[PDB]
Amino acid sequence: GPVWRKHYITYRINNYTPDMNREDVDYAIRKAFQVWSNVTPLKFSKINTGMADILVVFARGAHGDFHAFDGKGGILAHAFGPGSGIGGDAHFDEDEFWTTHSGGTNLFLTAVHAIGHSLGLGHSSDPKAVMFPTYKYVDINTFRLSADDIRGIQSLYG
């Protein structure tokens, strides 16, 4: 792909944004993984110790890779495709204001997109797809992947 060569994938939250209650961050990240397990045989486990496949990091500016962040706006997050070490990891720009609601940038929606990259998906050219390369705020209560996103991930895993 690269794709993960297993269906049991671990993640760990490296650090928490002070923008949100910790329980809200946990829920947003858990649900973002669940979106993808809903349409594939992938199974994600949150681990609290040891080395996870996907490390979730909040950082600002230059943060140890070739993808330095840019302050508020613009780059919200980036993620590496499947592989060892930094492979799979998902980084969120701390200069954004992360929220559960309509203010700032919505963490769950950003994480669904970032995790798609952590799984090996590229971008969609369809403006309505979750994997379109522009952030779009939508209602979480009615949230669904587009057919294009579903076809993409199932091609990789299903």
Ligand SMILES: O=C1NC(=O)[C@@](c2ccccc2)([C@]2(c3ccccc3)NC(=O)NC2=O)N1
């Ligand atoms: O304009 C963008 N800013 C983003 O962070 C990004 C994005 C993030 C979450 C959801 C949709 C879009 C994007 C990005 C980041 C840096 C430069 C360009 C795009 N980060 C990413 O993982 N895919 C992207 O398209 N697109």
Ligand SMILES: [Ca+2]
């Ligand atoms: Ca499943």
Ligand SMILES: [Ca+2]
């Ligand atoms: Ca990793």
Ligand SMILES: [Ca+2]
């Ligand atoms: Ca930014």
Ligand SMILES: [Ca+2]
């Ligand atoms: Ca912040």
Ligand SMILES: [Cl-]
């Ligand atoms: Cl922390």
Ligand SMILES: [Cl-]
């Ligand atoms: Cl599952």
Ligand SMILES: [Cl-]
């Ligand atoms: Cl778990």
Ligand SMILES: [Zn+2]
């Ligand atoms: Zn980048």
Ligand SMILES: [Zn+2]
């Ligand atoms: Zn990074």
Ligand SMILES: [Zn+2]
């Ligand atoms: Zn993207």
